[PDB]
Amino acid sequence: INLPSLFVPLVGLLFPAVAMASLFLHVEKR
Amino acid sequence: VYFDLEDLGNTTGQWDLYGSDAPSPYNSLQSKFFETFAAPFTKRGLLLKFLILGGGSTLAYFSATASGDILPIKKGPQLPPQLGPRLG
Amino acid sequence: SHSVKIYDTCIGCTQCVRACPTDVLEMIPWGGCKAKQIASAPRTEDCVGCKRCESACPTDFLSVRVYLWHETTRSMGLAY
Amino acid sequence: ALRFPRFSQGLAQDPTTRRIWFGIATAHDFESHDDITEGRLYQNIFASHFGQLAIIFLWTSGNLFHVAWQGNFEAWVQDPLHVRPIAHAIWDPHFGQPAVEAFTRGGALGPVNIAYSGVYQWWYTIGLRTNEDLYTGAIFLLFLSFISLLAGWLHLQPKWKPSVSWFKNAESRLNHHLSGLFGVSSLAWAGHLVHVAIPGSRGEYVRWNNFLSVLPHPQGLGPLFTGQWNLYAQNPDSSNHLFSTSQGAGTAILTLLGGFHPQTQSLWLTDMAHHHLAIAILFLIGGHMYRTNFGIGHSIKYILEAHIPPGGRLGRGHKGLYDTINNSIHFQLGLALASLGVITSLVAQHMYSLPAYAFIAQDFTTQAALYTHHQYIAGFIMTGAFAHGAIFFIRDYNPEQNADNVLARMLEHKEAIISHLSWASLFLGFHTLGLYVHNDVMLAFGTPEKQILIEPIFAQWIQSAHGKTSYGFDVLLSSTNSPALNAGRSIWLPGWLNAINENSNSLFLTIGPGDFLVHHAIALGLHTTTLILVKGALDARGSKLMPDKKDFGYSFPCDGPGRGGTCDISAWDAFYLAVFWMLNTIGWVTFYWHWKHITLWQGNVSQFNESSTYLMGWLRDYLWLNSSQLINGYNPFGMNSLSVWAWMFLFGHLVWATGFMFLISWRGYWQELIETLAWAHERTPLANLIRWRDKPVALSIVQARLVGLVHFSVGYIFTYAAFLIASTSGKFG
Amino acid sequence: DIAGLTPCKDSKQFAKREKQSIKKLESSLKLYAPDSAPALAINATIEKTKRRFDNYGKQGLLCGADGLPHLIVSGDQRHWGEFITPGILFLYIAGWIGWVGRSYLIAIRDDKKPTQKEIIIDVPLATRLVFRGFSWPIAAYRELLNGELVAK
Amino acid sequence: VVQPINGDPFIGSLETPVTSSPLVAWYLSNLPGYRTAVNPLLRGIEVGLAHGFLLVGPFVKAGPLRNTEIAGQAGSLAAGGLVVILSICLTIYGISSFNEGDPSTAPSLTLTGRKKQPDQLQTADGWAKFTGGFFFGGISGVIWAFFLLYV
Amino acid sequence: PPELDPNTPSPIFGGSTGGLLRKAQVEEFYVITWESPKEQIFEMPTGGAAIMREGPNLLKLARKEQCLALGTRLRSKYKIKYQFYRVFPSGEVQYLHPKDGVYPEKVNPGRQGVGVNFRSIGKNVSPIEVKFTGKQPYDL
Ligand code: CLA
Ligand code: CLA
Ligand code: CLA
């Protein structure tokens, strides 16, 4: 539990948010 | 006559619908408070570094220390587990 | 912008020009058919690609052909 | 060429949301990027294969890692028939306490998922025993994942970019792939079976630290080099051998016994070692066929050119085919997908009936998932094989350099080909459906003895030729004095005849009328799916309704409402249509596999033999009967470990049904609707302030066919997998 | 026997099925007066059930473990009534229909407006062609031998 | 009653008692988002104040701990968490929409048609200061509701 | 010599939700003009009925196709002549139709061929012959 409680929110909340924000700026750039 | 080449802004209706240029109606000293306390969050590049990392660390802390009284997934199983269908 | 092309089997009957909803096409003088005219596509940036023109064309194998291509706000027919 | 789709300025300049969608969808069609060359095309593909290898290795590495870290492999290997194998831990903060309890299974200390992939049986059979064994395996695959990315990157650097001429050296790649990729790998795999896997099965522990000091066979390599090869078969494991113990353990390393290890119900390791050694020798010899740098060998081009029947019935035979194939990557991938699709089905058919992995035969849910997983993979792969045949015909086919050869002659008589597939599909559909409907009516009217119930005599006669005695046909290996029976009596036939006549395994199951009907259903599906696909490929260049279709490419929305209407006229649309038929076909084959096995496992094949000859039987005694535990995985009274599958079961129904929206309603309806939302957004205060950077537009015609197809396929698969797993695991067959 | 089956005339499950079926109808039979129309009708079904089961037994049909007849279509000469024979009859009739159908399209193909006899049947013409079907094997084989059946 | 918008019948809108009435036009021109000549930073502070204060309600009273004693604290953290994520949406919206030199894309005309200075909210820095005020305002507004409800 | 564009009156219309949107302020828009012999009701291409004025008539529209649709209806039903233009946000005007003063249905000298291929369609090359060139078969 000491690691799943770290990686599950990281890969399921932080990484997708950081990825979705990254891709939003690349696709919108000109 | 709603067409004019010298005023293409009125021909296409580029009007501010409800924008009022009336001066600030706020407590002007509270303004000096809001203008100097909320100031470091007014750089979008730094704020994005802040919200991304601050939220990531905070989300990690709350989830790493969440007690069993809050999360059934950290409290864990309490009953004795039942066997499998083929004596599994 | 979509590509529109005319082939020399065209009999110059004008039916595609009349069908076109954005004035892409016109008749131009030609010596190749009895009607002595052929179609032409000088304004394909307004072409939306409805293919009303192909529907109009009488030639066995279309004399006017529309190749849908790069989309713009004109080809996509957007009013916004 | 300045925003998102850097490879398509045509799309970069699209002002609508369409730009983002198509940028994603076309990223891997290298041939259609701005300013591709032949060289860049090969080089991108080549590096893309290294990335695909890297993902495959990375994926296997995680599976190993998660089993070692969170699974019960070490308890499974000590009692393989009484431990549900664990896939990985679950950590979901949405769970309530009753979900935490229900999913806590195996010997685990928390909620876990049970693995239906069969990796425990696989890894155990080949020698893995300890969590450490698994860890260093994962690390090694992680290293291979990294190396694969290094070479991928490397070969995209100008110093290391391979030339087109190298990618087209066909003779050299074949020699190396046959003798090396196939042969040496098979030879080496036999080396692993002999050195690690077989000692493991005899209760010995051979690892890198000690394998140099232990003999695989007491006589060493002496017998190998003297030709006294029989010594290696001498003292085989007892038919009472207990797997992973020395009880009844022999010393043979290479055998030809046929049949099954009686306790594990899977093939003999010493048979599988002999098999990999034998085919290796054949691959190693075969990989010397083609000419390279040494002045011997064949020219594939010359071989093709020579194979033209004198008499002219194939026109110019195979002339030109070397460069037609060697210059078209869609041709190559078509052959690759076609061949891999056949052998993926072969894998599914052969693994359920001749399992290689100890204690997988009795893991019923695993056998069900494995068969179903490969038959669906095989189906998709087969549709791709024809889709790239179509793409070959449009992008790559040169009529003049193929003039009058066997490939051009296919186009010349496409109407003959297509209309006979049409005829064969019509025959099979009318009669198969007609026969089931007749039987249903007979059941409806209380007169089942008026069914039409044709015996699958041809297949039963084949089972008898194989030695099965169920039918009294007494042929070949079922005879008493056939030379076929006499020649193999001394070798593999004792173990084979035993297995084939044991009616509680899956080797050549007994078949009656129910097996007849659904096999013609299956032949209907194969014939109709290929009809769509062959018609799609052969008309891709042109039809009478669109004689210049090749000028429009593989996928285009249509050709407009003139000439009577032309929706779904492209070769891409024929593929799209065929996926429904492939999903139909695999559905029929997997329904059949599952229902035949679940009634086998339950001890009453007669439920299938009788209820399968009419379609109400399938609906009621297969789907409805076997849904009762699944739909109660949660109910107003609580939930249990079947809760996930009950939820995914409905999830699958929902995704599938959402697909219907994109498939039935078409674009123009939605574009006009979106316009009123553009208006509404630009007239709503506060929201006025916010503006989109991409103009909202309804999806493209083709896009919606795809999105609908994907929803349909996804829900199709998730619905059936949830049902398959829950129904089988809720009782263990 | 063939395919491990046994003759329906010797099959115990076949006999059981007839018995369970008659018992089912008799449960309904006992509701009605013996002269009544339903009694006669249910009795008519019962006799037909009995005729059917004896008929399948006397025709040589093989039965499976299920007690149901299973057809042997392999060619075996004891079972030509289960496929070969009704099949020859089907092909004879099917070819008759198709040969007559082609005769009519050919008869009208050179007419002025041919689609007019395709939506409004020229019944007199059809009564004259309907019996060309009797000999379609000979007529179709003859048009083949002299280039009339297929176009080049 | 129902007139063409600003007398132009070919602009894609109408002027109705809902779009432009004396009370409607007053309340909409008094919201912090339509204060076109005032500081965008102080707009966002009032916006964040009002929203973060509103967000505490639904999270606490409907969350998975709504019927426990850990209710007020969790939904408040969930309320601030919703403000954190929204501030990223506001930020990336500005990074993508406005550049460091572009002028305001706001209307430079009025309802009567005279030239005024555009709302600098619609600029890179004007947006950066607005979302900075929302974040500061939203966090303190979450706390202010958390202060009045469970302290 | 293309027509001019002043500030003529527009038809009588109560307004609708079908008219110009932000695209007109920022991209382009269109204006069609015409002369009618009398006041009369006609259907607006954006929905509803309007009354055209006798004599000069100006109408702003969001798309070119809306202009041609209204104009096509002016010739058929009302037998009046029409022109239209593309207006940019810089005030720049661009005459569009009828291009050379003559409707494109009727042949007119001075027009140069655009997009004419001097072959039958079925003579386009195969895609393989224009692969790795930037051309499609219909471009040669
Ligand atoms: C190879 C595929 C793979 C897959 C599908 C999973 C799946 C999972 N892992 Mg796992 N893991 C893997 C490899 C994998 N693992 C490897 C190689 C390691 C060692 C480095 C770990 C170490 C690890 C830990 C420590 C934990 C998980 C956990 C989990 C679970 C939650 C997701 C998560 O936190 O990921 C964590 C992911 C990582 C730590 C990253 C390592 C994996 C590689 C480097 C990234 C893969 C990228 C991916 C393939 C992109 C492909 C798409 C691309 C084409 C665009 C989930 C079941 C959690 C769990 O058990 O939940 C209960 C958890 O706590 N994983
Ligand atoms: C796969 C990743 C993932 C993970 C790890 C979570 C995790 C969680 N979800 Mg969930 N969720 C997900 C995906 C995920 N979600 C998706 C895809 C959906 C849409 C279908 C949802 C929809 C959903 C709903 C509708 C709800 C949850 C809720 C929850 C929380 C329930 C635990 C609890 O009882 O405490 C409850 C905890 C609180 C009330 C307060 C916790 C305060 C948080 C942890 C502080 C966050 C700080 C940080 C700044 C946030 C920004 C991070 C950013 C950088 C990425 C938990 C944090 C519940 C919830 O949080 O209640 C509001 C809830 O109601 N989820
Ligand atoms: C001995 C020399 C040698 C070897 C070992 C290889 C090996 C390979 N080459 Mg090759 N290559 C060679 C020489 C060699 N090459 C030469 C000389 C040339 C130039 C003439 C090339 C040019 C070349 C190109 C251009 C490409 C390759 C590619 C590949 C890879 C194919 C993908 C793959 O993993 O297939 C794996 C295949 C097998 C292991 C064979 C088995 C196939 C059957 C159907 C499967 C059997 C399944 C079996 C039952 C498994 C049991 C189940 C399992 C769960 C245990 C593979 C690594 C491709 C690649 O991916 O590049 C990175 C590629 O694009 N090669």
Ligand code: CLA
């Ligand atoms: C060796 C395998 C292989 C390879 C290398 C290729 C290579 C190619 N194919 Mg091909 N194909 C294959 C197998 C293969 N295919 C198979 C198995 C099929 C049957 C489905 C097809 C069917 C097919 C068609 C019909 C088409 C191609 C096309 C293409 C080309 C570009 C594809 C592209 O940009 O899409 C890139 C796609 C993406 C970046 C994302 C796609 C995502 C897919 C569509 C949905 C995934 C759903 C996913 C499971 C969701 C899960 C949900 C979750 C809840 C579980 C490229 C030459 C296209 C082309 O350009 O030809 C002219 C084309 O139209 N292929």
Ligand code: CLA
């Ligand atoms: C209850 C009995 C029954 C019923 C209702 C049907 C109904 C049907 N059958 Mg079937 N059939 C049956 C019994 C039955 N069959 C039996 C017992 C056999 C074994 C002989 C067959 C063998 C059979 C074949 C081989 C074919 C049919 C076909 C058909 C369909 C059209 C046939 C027709 O007359 O069109 C009217 C007739 C024509 C339009 C002329 C062309 C079709 C006929 C059959 C050609 C016959 C002459 C030709 C030389 C013989 C075939 C050569 C070879 C392939 C065997 C129709 C759905 C046809 C089909 O499925 O087409 C897709 C077809 O080809 N049936």
Ligand code: CLA
């Ligand atoms: C259960 C649904 C269903 C059914 C019955 C069919 C049936 C058929 N499809 Mg189809 N299809 C379906 C779903 C279905 N499809 C879906 C979901 C898709 C995806 C878009 C397609 C896409 C598709 C394509 C692309 C192709 C087919 C083809 C075929 C034919 C296959 C050959 C065959 O069986 O001949 C036998 C015919 C039948 C079984 C049809 C029913 C016959 C009826 C029952 C006889 C009626 C007799 C009775 C007197 C009628 C009384 C009615 C009264 C009102 C007068 C057949 C007409 C192929 C084809 O045309 O091959 C020639 C083909 O190319 N289908």
Ligand code: CLA
């Ligand atoms: C003169 C009648 C006639 C004849 C001789 C044939 C003959 C043939 N058809 Mg055709 N067909 C017909 C009518 C006919 N068809 C009609 C009406 C339809 C529309 C439903 C079709 C639709 C059809 C399809 C979709 C296919 C064939 C195919 C075929 C070939 C294989 C046999 C088969 O599949 O039968 C199939 C027969 C049917 C599906 C239905 C036809 C049955 C009708 C009832 C018979 C005609 C009755 C007609 C009204 C008689 C009036 C005569 C009277 C005035 C005297 C063969 C050339 C197949 C092929 O090309 O293989 C190479 C194929 O794929 N046909």
Ligand SMILES: CC1=C(/C=C/C(C)=C/C=C/C(C)=C/C=C/C=C(C)/C=C/C=C(C)/C=C/C2=C(C)CCCC2(C)C)C(C)(C)CCC1
């Ligand atoms: C369109 C196209 C294409 C495609 C194609 C395809 C997709 C195909 C498929 C195909 C397939 C998919 C097929 C298959 C086949 C199979 C086979 C051919 C098999 C055979 C077999 C055999 C021969 C066997 C035998 C036996 C037995 C049975 C028993 C034991 C012994 C033995 C082994 C002898 C291509 C790419 C070319 C290109 C061009 C175009």
Ligand code: SF4
């Ligand atoms: S329609 Fe066909 S034929 Fe008539 S003018 Fe246009 S192109 Fe030439």
